[PDB]
């Protein structure tokens, strides 16, 4: 019997009274619209935005911590090389803004060097992420944003084929150029590749040897969240799949890395975590289309100016519910991203890694995405700050979270009544 319910569960009687009242239902739908703007239209104040940013920053930070220590080398086919030096610029190397892949004779592979094929993949994703972070991520609702990205590497050494026609696509290795246009998203992305040779005795050449320099200029690269998360996923998965050898320089006094030698995928807890964050951020961003597809802006009420009937006049409810559920699901995944990496709940060597390296910068802060001779061995990706801002944004989403729950309960009541 129902009177006997509405004693023991008083807030349910209130819920039913609201579910039969168009003005209360409309008030809930106006709240959904506003909380959706907070989630997908804002940046500083959006928990969703901060959780995306955090997931990206952790991937980038992971590499800033470990890239300098990671061996890479060999030739273009994944093959060993007898004497090849390949230097990638704007990367966090030891006491340098470049990383040098100069490990010969050893076969690239697991617990060996990272092939240059993989390093190219990793590097491209890294340059893109660092350029986007630097300009600032757009709000989640903005997808038609793009960014331009430029990056360079150099090949020296006898027999080094990492800058050749086959590796590059450029017919002429000296002064040549190639344009191609793959389409990431349903978006076109123009890539201009260009090559120049610099002889040993050419003027203004520090390195006493002669080299080829490849420049990549990518235009119209998607800077949306879905796009950038795919880049972070590529970065962390490339690392995890190549699983190259690394060894670190443990600085005097310092914070201390363990293990000192080993293989990059040996950081299982740290990589799992980052992969998890990216996965949860991707599911979170996917809720955006559910929210857009179910606008709550049209007022509801009876028809033929007769009283509202929650049993028949309520077909909007499925969509209201789907929307509210989406917003709620966003907020929970955002929280869950934060809890994956937040050191308050981490333990043992995964905690040392985050508190002593990942959530740390050694640059003299400098803006997001800048790479300096001191970047190595620290995250330099605003991780402590992003965690703090994610928490602040959630704390300031108190009201909206409750409004979403009420909207979901009104809708859910109406979906029930209609059957």
């Amino acid at each position, epitope marked *: 019997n129902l009177s006997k319910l509405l004693t023991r569960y008083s807030t349910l009687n209130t819920l039913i009274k609201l579910s039969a009242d168009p003005s209360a239902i409309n008030a809930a739908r106006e709240n959904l619209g506003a909380s959706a703007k907070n989630l997908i239209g804002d940046t500083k104040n959006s928990p969703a935005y901060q959780a995306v940013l955090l997931a990206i920053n952790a991937a980038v930070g992971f590499w800033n911590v470990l890239g300098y220590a990671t061996q890479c080398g060999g030739n273009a086919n994944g093959q060993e090389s007898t004497s090849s030096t390949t230097i990638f610029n704007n990367e966090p190397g030891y006491r340098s803004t470049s990383i040098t892949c100069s490990l010969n004779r050893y076969k690239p592979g697991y617990y060996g060097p990272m092939s240059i094929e993989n390093f190219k993949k990793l590097n491209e994703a890294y340059q893109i992420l660092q350029t986007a972070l630097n300009k600032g991520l757009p709000a989640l609702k903005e997808n038609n944003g793009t960014v331009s990205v430029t990056y360079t590497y150099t090949c020296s050494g006898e027999g080094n084929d990492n800058c050749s026609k086959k590796a590059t696509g450029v017919s002429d290795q000296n002064g040549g150029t190639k344009t191609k246009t793959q389409t990431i998203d349903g978006k076109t992305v123009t890539t201009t590749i260009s090559s120049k040779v610099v002889d040993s005795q050419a003027k203004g050449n520090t390195t006493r040897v002669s080299y080829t320099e490849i420049t990549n200029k990518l235009d119209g690269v998607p800077d949306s969240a879905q796009a950038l998360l795919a880049q972070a996923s590529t970065l962390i998965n490339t690392i995890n799949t190549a699983c190259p050898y690394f060894s670190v320089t443990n600085k005097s006094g310092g914070p201390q890395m363990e293990p000192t030698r080993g293989k990059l995928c040996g950081f299982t807890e740290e990589i799992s975590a980052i992969q998890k964050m990216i996965t949860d951020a991707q599911e979170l961003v996917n809720q955006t289309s559910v929210i857009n597809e179910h606008e709550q802006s049209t007022p509801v009420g009876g028809n033929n100016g007769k009283p509202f009937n929650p049993f028949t006049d309520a077909s909007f409810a499925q969509g209201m519910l789907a929307n509210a559920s989406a917003q709620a699901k966003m907020l929970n995944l955002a929280h869950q991203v934060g809890q994956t990496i937040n050191p*308050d709940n981490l333990t043992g060597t995964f905690k040392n890694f985050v508190t002593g390296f990942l959530a740390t910068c050694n640059n003299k802060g400098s803006p997001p995405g800048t790479v300096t001779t001191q970047t190595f061995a620290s995250g330099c990706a605003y991780v402590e700050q992003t965690i703090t801002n994610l928490n602040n944004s959630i*704390a300031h989403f108190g009201t909206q979270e409750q409004q979403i729950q009420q909207a979901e309960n009104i809708a859910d009541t109406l979906v029930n009544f209609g059957s």
Partner: nanobody
Amino acid sequence: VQLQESGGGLVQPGGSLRLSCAASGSIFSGNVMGWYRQAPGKLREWVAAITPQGVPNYADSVKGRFTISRDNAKNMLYLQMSSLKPEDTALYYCNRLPNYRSWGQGTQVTVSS
């Protein structure tokens, strides 16, 4: 997976009350925590929140009169209430933000002369 509020009672307008909430570590550690209230005839409304780093924020209806605080050593959450009015009469609940989906029993506060 446990939330226990206490400290509620019947007070006069102008009164003070300190509510307490004993949260488990799961819920409390590294999490934003907050207070809520559910008044006669209404659904549950958010009242205040506080980040792990101790930064507090408040609903307009209580700002300037209520203070929220947290003891990280003992997983405790506190709400100091001042200048109570009849309108503050309600069941008060703590939870984390976003909410763990089982609520404590809550603690009744009644402001009245």
